[PDB]
Tab-separated table of C-alpha atoms in Angstrom:
chain	number	residue	atom	x	y	z
R	1	UNK	CA	147.286	62.646	63.638
R	2	UNK	CA	144.067	63.768	65.339
R	3	UNK	CA	143.499	66.435	67.985
R	4	UNK	CA	140.170	67.219	69.646
R	5	UNK	CA	138.916	69.649	72.296
R	6	UNK	CA	135.470	70.103	73.844
R	7	UNK	CA	134.047	72.366	76.548
R	8	UNK	CA	130.347	72.231	77.495
R	9	UNK	CA	129.040	74.499	80.260
R	10	UNK	CA	125.370	74.465	81.228
R	11	UNK	CA	123.116	75.879	83.936
R	12	UNK	CA	119.499	75.534	85.024
R	13	UNK	CA	118.240	78.080	87.566
R	14	UNK	CA	114.696	78.027	88.961
R	15	UNK	CA	113.434	80.651	91.428
R	16	UNK	CA	109.953	81.234	92.841
R	17	UNK	CA	108.096	83.121	95.542
R	18	UNK	CA	104.627	83.136	97.060
R	19	UNK	CA	103.100	85.601	99.528
R	20	UNK	CA	99.605	85.760	101.037
R	21	UNK	CA	97.907	87.999	103.603
R	22	UNK	CA	94.521	88.057	105.346
R	23	UNK	CA	94.412	91.021	107.736
R	24	UNK	CA	91.181	92.223	109.369
R	25	UNK	CA	90.851	95.577	111.154
R	26	UNK	CA	87.764	96.124	113.281
R	27	UNK	CA	87.193	99.825	113.939
R	28	UNK	CA	83.788	100.092	115.621
R	29	UNK	CA	81.310	97.844	117.389
R	30	UNK	CA	77.617	98.243	118.159
R	31	UNK	CA	74.852	96.670	120.212
R	32	UNK	CA	71.187	97.213	119.340
R	33	UNK	CA	68.616	97.827	122.058
R	34	UNK	CA	66.407	94.852	122.912
R	35	UNK	CA	63.057	96.692	122.898
R	36	UNK	CA	61.120	99.686	121.518
R	37	UNK	CA	63.112	99.412	118.280
R	38	UNK	CA	61.880	101.967	115.733
R	39	UNK	CA	61.253	100.187	112.428
R	40	UNK	CA	61.936	101.725	109.034
R	41	UNK	CA	58.887	103.003	107.184
R	42	UNK	CA	59.375	100.692	104.183
R	43	UNK	CA	59.429	97.673	106.504
R	44	UNK	CA	56.542	98.993	108.585
R	45	UNK	CA	54.554	99.514	105.364
R	46	UNK	CA	55.391	95.981	104.225
R	47	UNK	CA	54.189	94.539	107.542
R	48	UNK	CA	51.029	96.669	107.494
R	49	UNK	CA	50.238	95.524	103.956
R	50	UNK	CA	50.450	91.835	104.934
A	1	UNK	CA	72.422	95.843	77.503
A	2	UNK	CA	70.591	98.147	79.871
A	3	UNK	CA	67.482	99.543	78.189
A	4	UNK	CA	65.346	102.589	78.976
A	5	UNK	CA	63.895	103.893	82.252
A	6	UNK	CA	61.214	101.517	83.541
A	7	UNK	CA	60.980	102.388	87.263
A	8	UNK	CA	60.717	105.840	88.832
A	9	UNK	CA	63.681	105.802	91.239
A	10	UNK	CA	62.898	109.265	92.685
A	11	UNK	CA	59.331	109.115	94.044
A	12	UNK	CA	60.124	110.403	97.538
A	13	UNK	CA	56.561	109.923	98.801
A	14	UNK	CA	56.864	113.076	100.899
A	15	UNK	CA	59.476	111.413	103.107
A	16	UNK	CA	62.749	113.084	104.078
A	17	UNK	CA	64.776	109.858	103.859
A	18	UNK	CA	68.324	111.173	104.197
A	19	UNK	CA	71.324	108.857	104.034
A	20	UNK	CA	74.890	109.952	104.685
A	21	UNK	CA	77.030	108.316	102.010
A	22	UNK	CA	80.117	108.116	104.235
A	23	UNK	CA	81.956	107.381	101.083
A	24	UNK	CA	81.592	110.550	99.038
A	25	UNK	CA	81.125	112.411	102.346
A	26	UNK	CA	77.714	113.776	101.319
A	27	UNK	CA	74.020	113.381	102.156
A	28	UNK	CA	71.658	111.935	99.540
A	29	UNK	CA	67.863	111.666	99.459
A	30	UNK	CA	66.549	108.185	98.719
A	31	UNK	CA	63.146	107.510	97.261
A	32	UNK	CA	60.475	106.568	99.771
A	33	UNK	CA	60.112	103.016	98.459
A	34	UNK	CA	63.641	101.738	97.738
A	35	UNK	CA	64.277	98.746	99.988
A	36	UNK	CA	67.921	99.631	100.443
A	37	UNK	CA	70.780	101.695	99.051
A	38	UNK	CA	74.218	101.366	100.653
A	39	UNK	CA	77.760	102.566	100.004
A	40	UNK	CA	80.239	100.039	101.414
A	41	UNK	CA	83.094	99.559	98.934
A	42	UNK	CA	84.757	96.475	97.470
A	43	UNK	CA	87.824	96.217	95.227
A	44	UNK	CA	89.137	93.289	93.173
A	45	UNK	CA	92.446	93.184	91.271
A	46	UNK	CA	93.924	90.323	89.204
A	47	UNK	CA	97.328	90.449	87.456
A	48	UNK	CA	98.585	87.805	85.014
A	49	UNK	CA	102.179	88.475	83.867
A	50	UNK	CA	103.652	85.800	81.586
């Protein structure tokens, strides 16, 4: 006489996430005058030395 | 490696070249000849969990 029993349980779980953000917050704006702009002295000196 | 002091970074040339750091909330005196010095901030972070 032979008797036999088997029980095989298995699982495969796979879980993932991804998250991405690109948020831009402007907080001030400016516009430069068109004329009579006062140059910086290091730039003025570079121009004068040319 | 950074080596010893080659350039004089503090020759003010008799100028009163104030900059407000914005960051650090203080006023600093630049040398008369530095082409620029600015205090906008960047941050980079990388994690690798495994």
